[PDB]
Amino acid sequence: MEAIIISGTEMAKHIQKEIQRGVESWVSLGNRRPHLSIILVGDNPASHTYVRNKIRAASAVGICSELILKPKDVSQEELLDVTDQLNMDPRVSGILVQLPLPDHVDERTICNGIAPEKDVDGFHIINIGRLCLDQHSLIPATASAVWEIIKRTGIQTFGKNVVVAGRSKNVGMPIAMLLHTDGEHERPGGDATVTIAHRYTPKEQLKIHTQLADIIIVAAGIPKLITSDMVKEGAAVIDVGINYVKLVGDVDFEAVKKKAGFITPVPGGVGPMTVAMLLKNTLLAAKKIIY
Ligand SMILES: Nc1nc(N)c(NC(=O)Nc2ccc(C(=O)N[C@@H](CCC(=O)O)C(=O)O)cc2)c(=O)[nH]1
Ligand SMILES: Nc1ncnc2c1ncn2[C@@H]1O[C@H](COP(=O)(O)OP(=O)(O)O)[C@@H](O)[C@H]1OP(=O)(O)O
């Protein structure tokens, strides 16, 4: 069947309008306009592209931003000095450290250096802890994005088989967490039956599991990891992969769009929604209502 191709770009646009209305409403009440401080380390052109999209989108919804550049050979200590300063600046509502960081910087240490209340990526251990206990939290943007695409398309999760191909602590694990957890908890989940796959799932076992799946979510960085033979007729296929090989996903799109009932393209799928959900988090953080 010809898959319905989900426009992340368009959905992100609708959602940015909602956040824009949200920001004006917050400022209409006597409150400070959200300010997002972004730290970009080094010269990765993809990292530079994503931060520009984030600043441009922030501007569009009336969220102030400032870009703090650091060179690739910056120290862990120097990064934590900046995060400390930003934590103490009451005009900064949100702090984002673009990943990945240089190999000599411990990611987990920097993530934990951001005040939870300002942690718009939700990578701080307290925010991860609260996510894993289904409490109100700043929910990681890409994970939020996937959940939002699913809900606004009307893809049913409740009682459904879902495979998450990816266990990363920033993307994979949060997706598994949102999708499988109780619909009635403080932070509702999808009530889906979730299989977690990763680099040590034999491909033959991954296929056996995807074949039974009502939803495949792949966040692997392996072009054509998901081939049409792996997909159940009518299934939803959410492609979080970004592969510069030409930009392609983890899904064999031209084949899988003939088998699936719903597919996200790359580019134009999860990417723009990552940006949108970060801005939602930036507004939410500014209102200081979780902590
Ligand atoms: N701290 C932190 N680091 C991170 N690395 C991420 N992820 C993180 O920025 N992802 C991301 C991926 C793609 C796009 C994007 O704009 N994608 C478009 C355009 C792609 C392109 O021009 O190359 C698309 O898929 O259509 C934006 C953000 C994050 O959310 N927080
Ligand atoms: N063949 C495969 N099948 C399913 N998932 C795979 C996969 N190969 C990689 N992945 C997963 O896709 C994800 C890639 O995410 P990532 O690049 O952000 O990695 P990291 O967690 O090290 O930062 C990983 O969770 C990865 O599994 P590992 O934790 O074992 O590295």
Residue numbers in the entry: 49 to 293, 302 to 347
Provide the publication's sentences verbatim.
MTHFD2L is an isoform of MTHFD2 (72 % amino acid sequence identity), which also catalyzes oxidation of methylene−THF to 10‐formyl−THF. The enzyme is expressed in all adult tissues analyzed to date, as well as in embryonic cells. MTHFD2L is capable of using either NAD+ or NADP+ as a cofactor, however its overall catalytic efficiency is much lower than MTHFD2. The MTHFD2L monomer is comprised of two domains, which are connected via two long alpha helices (α1 and α10) and a smaller alpha helix (α5), positioned such that there is a large cleft between the domains.
MTHFD2L was co‐crystallized with TH7299 and the inhibitor‐bound structure was solved to 2.10 Å resolution. The protein crystallizes as a monomer in the asymmetric unit but is dimeric in solution. The ligand is located in a cleft between the N‐ and C‐terminal domains, with the inhibitor primarily supported by residues from the N‐terminal domain. The diaminopyrimidine head group of TH7299 is positioned by key hydrogen bond interactions with Asp169 and the main chain atoms of Val145 and Leu147. The urea linker and central phenyl ring are oriented by hydrogen bonding with Asn101, Lys102 and Gln146, as well as an important pi‐stacking interaction with Tyr98. The glutamate tail of the inhibitor forms hydrogen bonds with the backbone nitrogen of Gly324 and the side chain oxygen of Tyr292. NADP+ is bound within a large cleft formed between the N‐ and C‐terminal domains of MTHFD2L, with the cofactor mostly supported by interactions with the C‐terminal domain. It was evident during structure refinement that there was only consistent electron density for part of NADP+, and the ribose and nicotinamide moiety at one end of the cofactor were therefore not included in the final structure. The residues that interact with TH7299 are nearly identical in both isozymes, an important exception being Arg278 (MTHFD2) which is a tyrosine (Tyr292) in MTHFD2L. The hydrogen bond formed by Tyr292 of MTHFD2L and TH7299 may allow the inhibitor to be positioned more tightly in the folate binding site relative to MTHFD2, explaining the more potent TH7299 inhibition observed for the MTHFD2L isoform.
